[PDB]
Homo-oligomer: 130 residues x 3
């Protein structure tokens, strides 16, 4: 009755292949699936920093589909396959995207697997119901 799926514009088949929605808009909240730096075919961008950038691009595209932007993000959780050797690269990209306060909150955790990817960002955004 409210379960409305949101998908990035264009063609991205991982959502079709694995059968899950890119995001779910429910009332005044948008719950986004973890985003990864994947190409149109579902494979990861080889270079790490590039994968992180692409992940953010895919995130933005998914947010756009709901009329959202990074400014509407109210909760952030990131997963890392090897956070130790990846944080400098991640911060470079994060400080480029989140340039000025109020900064988003954040929970970064080290995981053992991300379906072939090395970075993933799970986000929740507010969607005012007007």
């Amino acid at each position: 009755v409210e379960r409305t799926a949101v998908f990035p514009a264009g063609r991205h088949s991982l959502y079709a292949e694995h059968r899950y929605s890119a995001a779910i808009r429910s009332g005044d909240l948008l719950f986004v699936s973890g985003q990864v730096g994947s190409r149109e075919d579902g494979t990861p961008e080889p270079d790490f920093q590039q994968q992180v950038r692409l992940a953010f691009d895919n995130l933005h595209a998914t947010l756009a589909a709901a009329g959202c932007t990074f400014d509407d993000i109210i909760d952030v959780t990131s997963f890392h396959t090897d956070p130790e050797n990846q944080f400098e690269d991640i911060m470079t990209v994060k400080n480029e995207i989140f340039s000025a306060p109020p900064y988003p909150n954040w929970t970064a955790v080290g995981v053992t697997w991300l379906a072939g990817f090395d970075f993933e960002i799970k986000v929740i955004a507010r969607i005012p119901e007007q």
Copy 2:
């Protein structure tokens, strides 16, 4: 003033043993504790695919206690102790439960421990306040 606990019908003592609620209903949202394929005594179902199925059964039972069903799930996060050798089994079960779109969103992550279990699913569901 709003912190109302929700428990699956019947007797399941892991919540009593570890002292935590199966789910929390707050306003128009239901935050469910991660569900696992555990028997009444708190031990895991030995066979993997069976554990995943039981986990979903336990999830459904917890949702039912709040008047919810899988259709009310607005966010899904799953943890895996060895995602590589478990995804085919997991998809078999997921495609049986989530048979048709709109599919739920999803974030699957590889973890190192799940208190003896090999699969866990953390969910958030919408509970319209009428």
Copy 3:
């Protein structure tokens, strides 16, 4: 338009150093960044049980900044670097803080990294908009 950051009273520079907010108040919900047992300089409390206690103290301080307390927590997720040898210590502290029902829900997961810490707690609290 709603993205309002919340910070624990006093001086804690990890939020400044890593550029992220301690919590985000959005409508009737407060999304708190994972809390860890860190000193004012950002380093962890050496003793485990002490780190867990400090983590809870830092959590309470962040909640206070929004006018919240542990009673307003509606969702709990904890990460552990070595859950096997840490659960007895964690429960000692949890049973001291969450002494009586309704207990909070809970999702505990084993992770590989937490930026030098061994325990982290990500929480969501309800903030009635009156």
